[PDB]
Design a protein around this ligand. Structure first.
Ligand code: ZN
Lengths: 130, 88, 48, 40
């Protein structure tokens, strides 16, 4: 008959089926399945991945890719590439919205369920990026 | 004459005669140079119109990145590029 | 994700009176010297 | 192995690269990595 394929997981997680209270620092850099209640849901915000620009003097389209520590599982060297407003020859660039790519980003807060929480203590919560 | 050059002629136009003993090889000075930041990737151009100095860099690459002071980007993506971050 | 704002100028008023030590007036006088100098009957610097 | 500190980093990342002081390589490839050059 281009976007890379993602993976999702179901099944028994064993000791990795945890709670926002039960999550400690021994579970860092591990795949965890956390059950809870959603308390806060941030606004779905687009995040720029590749920006496309136009040079009218030479009439050419450029692009720049952007990455952060969230989109990758393996940490790489952080190279902050600034937003290009000028090409290598010195000509002004116009941002081509509609050709740039934006990926929806959300933050949610997962708290322990009031059914499984201790009845008098303050609840524990975690942040999840989507 | 070359023997009557004094401190009153410093930074002055002088006409003086003599003989030529040696001519050096042609060194390459930079008139227009494009610089790029190492990690910031900020592109800048330095134009030089004064090459007639000796023993000293009267024009040098900037000590720090110029992306912060210019504020060209509205988003403006503490991040410092480091000392002398530009390559030619 | 907006562009860099640009700055431009346009001459409107006369402004302050020009001074001889100003760089612009020195450049203009030099330009007139190049364009208007005659040795015998020819603009030698213009032709050069 | 010490975690008793509050309001302060008693152990932090090195201020400069440790490749020059160690002299681990005989080839030893002025080059400076910059202030605080380490990433966790
Ligand atoms: Zn930079």
């Amino acid at each position: 008959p281009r976007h890379p394929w993602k993976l999702s997981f179901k099944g028994s997680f064993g000791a990795h089926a945890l709670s926002p209270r039960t999550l400690t620092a021994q579970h860092l850099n591990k795949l965890v399945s956390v059950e809870g209640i959603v308390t806060k849901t941030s606004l779905v915000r687009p995040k720029l991945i590749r920006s496309v620009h136009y040079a009218a003097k030479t009439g050419r389209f450029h692009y720049r890719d952007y990455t952060d520590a969230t989109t990758t599982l393996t940490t790489r060297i952080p190279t902050p590439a600034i937003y290009p407003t000028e090409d290598t020859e010195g000509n002004k660039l116009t941002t081509e919205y509609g050709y740039s790519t934006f990926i929806d980003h959300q933050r949610i807060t997962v708290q322990e369920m009031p059914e499984m929480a201790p009845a008098g203590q303050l609840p524990r919560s975690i942040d999840v990026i989507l | 004459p070359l023997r009557d050059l004094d401190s009153e002629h410093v930074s002055k136009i002088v006409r003086l005669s003599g003989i030529i003993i040696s001519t050096s090889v042609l060194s390459s000075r930079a008139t227009y140079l494009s610089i790029m930041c190492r990690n910031c990737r900020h592109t800048t151009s330095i134009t030089i119109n004064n090459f007639n100095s000796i023993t000293g860099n009267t024009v040098s690459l900037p000590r720090s990145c110029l992306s912060t002071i210019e504020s060209e980007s509205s988003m403006a993506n503490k991040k410092n590029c480091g000392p002398d971050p530009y390559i030619i | 994700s907006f562009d860099r704002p640009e700055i431009y100028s346009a001459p409107v008023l006369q402004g302050e009176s020009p001074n001889d030590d100003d760089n612009t007036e020195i450049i203009k006088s030099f330009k007139n010297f190049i364009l208007e100098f005659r040795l015998d009957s020819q603009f030698i610097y213009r032709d050069q």
